[PDB]
Design a protein around this ligand. Sequence first.
Ligand SMILES: Nc1nc2c(ncn2[C@H]2C[C@H](O)[C@@H](COP(=O)(O)OP(=O)(O)OP(=O)(O)O)O2)c(=O)[nH]1
Ligand SMILES: [Ca+2]
Ligand SMILES: [Ca+2]
Ligand SMILES: [Ca+2]
Ligand SMILES: [Ca+2]
Ligand SMILES: [Ca+2]
Length: 903
Amino acid sequence: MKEFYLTVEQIGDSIFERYIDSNGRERTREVEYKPSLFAHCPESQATKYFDIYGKPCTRKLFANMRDASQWIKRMEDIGLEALGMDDFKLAYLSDTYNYEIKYDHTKIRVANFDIEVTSPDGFPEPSQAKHPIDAITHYDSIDDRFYVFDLLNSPYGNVEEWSIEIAAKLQEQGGDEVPSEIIDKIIYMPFDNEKELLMEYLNFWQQKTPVILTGWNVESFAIPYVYNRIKNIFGESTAKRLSPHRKTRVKVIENMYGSREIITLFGISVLDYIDLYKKFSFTNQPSYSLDYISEFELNVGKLKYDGPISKLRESNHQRYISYNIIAVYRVLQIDAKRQFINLSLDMGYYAKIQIQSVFSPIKTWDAIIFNSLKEQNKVIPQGRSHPVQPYPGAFVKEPIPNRYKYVMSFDLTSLYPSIIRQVNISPETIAGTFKVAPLHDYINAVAERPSDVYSCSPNGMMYYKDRDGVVPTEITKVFNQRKEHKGYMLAAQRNGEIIKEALHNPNLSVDEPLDVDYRFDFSDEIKEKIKKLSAKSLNEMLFRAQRTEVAGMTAQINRKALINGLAGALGNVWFRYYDLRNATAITTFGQMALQWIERKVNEYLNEVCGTEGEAFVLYGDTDSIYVSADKIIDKVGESKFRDTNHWVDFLDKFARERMEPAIDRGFREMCEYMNNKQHLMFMDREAIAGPPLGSKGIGGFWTGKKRYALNVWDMEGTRYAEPKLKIMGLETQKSSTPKAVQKALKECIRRMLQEGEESLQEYFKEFEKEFRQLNYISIASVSSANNIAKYDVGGFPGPKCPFHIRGILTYNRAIKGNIDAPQVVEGEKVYVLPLREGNPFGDKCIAWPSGTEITDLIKDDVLHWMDYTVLLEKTFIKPLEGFTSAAKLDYEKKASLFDMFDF
DNA sequence: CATTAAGCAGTCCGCG
DNA sequence: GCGGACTGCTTAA
Ligand SMILES: Nc1nc2c(ncn2[C@H]2C[C@H](O)[C@@H](COP(=O)(O)OP(=O)(O)OP(=O)(O)O)O2)c(=O)[nH]1
Ligand SMILES: [Ca+2]
Ligand SMILES: [Ca+2]
Ligand SMILES: [Ca+2]
Ligand SMILES: [Ca+2]
Ligand SMILES: [Ca+2]
């Protein structure tokens, strides 16, 4: 088999590499790497090395990495460019693996762990690690085993061994309901003292040294806690055994009233699952407890226990250990669905970077581009310092706030990467400039043609048409991968709807789910079989289809993020290829493209409808247009349609067969105007929206820019079994909006769009009457808690103190003296509730850590003093007022002359 | 070591 | 009480 790295580190003049050899064995080696860098040399110098602008370079081979570093400094002092890869481990990986890396994940040791630490005096700080570690569960992906290290004797209590038999039993039978499918994979190890637990865990760690180290919050809690506890008990040399190279780095972060630390373990790639989730999931969650995320991802209930976690081990050691095990497994379950570890491995090996560098788009692209250029014997430019400079982005159209009955939307495929490729935007393809006219002159095709020789952007840049750019070349590779996965995702999505349609008529039989590949549209034969399947088999198939869709989503959306990240990176001062000429060439071209096609679509639709000067395009943002389709429907007449699906089909056909070709013609002209390298402006129909035929639904509304709701029947070729709400920007979409309020506002919207004003009025009345009965957590607002210290004046709010911070300070006063109350952590999220006048907390609101019940000693008073009137007004009524006034609709029946009568 | 556009909630302040 | 700067937060793209 081909060899591949596991980890790589630079320690002084040594490269330390863990790798898999040709026999598939894990190996380690220390290499005294001899790096090369480059200097510009005279033209008369015969060389095989050229910089990206074609200037000749001489290679300088150094005896060691320090020598190479010191030469860089001398060159800086001289005032001459020192070219080449300055991150030497990237050069090392490039030299060692001079081929496309084909890796085997089964040979990669992925470790998932978590620890338990009983603490009678508040949160057990990792930097101090003053309490015993009393449990570790460590799952190893090679053994496929949960290794459980259980402390039986502690200063905080002596306990009996955990029982696997009780653990497997249903909770309703007094058990812990440890999932049956892992019961046989648990290796249980009790310990009479912490020293032998820890010693044995370290020996175990040596035998089974993680390559990928993950788990929930491992980087901020488990890793630094274990490292520090071992340091305190055995000494720091022993703690360094957690590094296969015995080298660590301690990062102390000062928070005025916190002081925590992160530990770098050289030769291990830590990918904290919370960080992976935040980066790759494209959610913004109100809480990041494993409980909350597990419920969201897996629809599993919270791990329940009685009393505080500080007393769980002594009162219920059986449950304590089971919950430690289950928490480890839950992360594995989330990853089985989301596949972020797989994604990280794919991306890291593709780029030839340390796996943990997938968190950095700049590092990822630096390595991809370096590897591409190195292949052509080209030499990369030195990184330079640049002052931070704001620059212009996308165009957003101001919509007229209103209801919009029939809407069809269109948007550009992968816009910014497509612009890069169409225009040929790269550091080394710049051909010169032209004299800019105002943007609106390009939009309206009145400005002089920029160039008849080079490929142009309306920002004034010109690019070579007849040569490849590393940026277009490498962005295309990732785009093509992205396109493949999105195809799989969309096929699975359409397949899902086929199954959902079939679930309307399930067959009364005993059968099995069809063995199919959900990444491809079902054949006619498969569809015929599906129509004869039982509900049980259909529901199993639907789970499999959705799981396939999620996998495709992870794969496509994060590749989309990577390529959009390159367009953004051009505008980041730390990027080797930072260049506002290139960054603005993209954004400015995008603004022209949107407004050009707005014009073209208005012209086309007026023509085919036989009118003049009517505005069909009601809105647009960055690369999308929203077309009012009322006049299209009215042209044929609503009466002609048999049902909703009839007009949906009609608009679908209209968009594909009439509008899209016209759009294509419009963009091809634009391409010729800018004399671009390749026409890649592909604008396809996105949504078809409207009310159910014969209903009083309004179909859609806009309140303003980035704020709208649409009742969608077809999205990007997926014909829904049931209409789906597309809501963007409104409070239903925001993590700061109370959970029950998101739900109620969405139902208000559903009623508006699908049923009409009276239906809305009926729901509002009901919700207002029942609001006070909702659980306090379901009606609490949410906010991130940043710069808490800044506004803290003796426990009271300083000037300009934000509302949520005021709540935190109220909470801090209420819990002061009590050691057993949960502390608010700087930068994390809190629930927030307004408080009635004269409350015993002595302020207008309280805030506490999100995803938690508010501590028992103050929960009673919060409930009593909660301001329901303020909460309803602020979170529910005011946003609804926004929606309904925009839609020209009332949520409460207004007074009328009819009030004089008895109905 | 490492993208911009834009809406809304809230504080401070002016206001016989 | 409610608008106009200005901060903070969180979206859409
Ligand atoms: N830097 C950066 N730019 C973004 C991001 N999301 C969107 N944009 C910019 C670049 C996109 O090309 C453009 C249009 O956004 P879309 O959401 O329509 O995505 P895009 O067209 O890239 O892909 P698509 O094929 O429509 O899924 O807006 C992002 O997360 N980061
Ligand atoms: Ca725990
Ligand atoms: Ca798009
Ligand atoms: Ca059937
Ligand atoms: Ca879009
Ligand atoms: Ca599309």
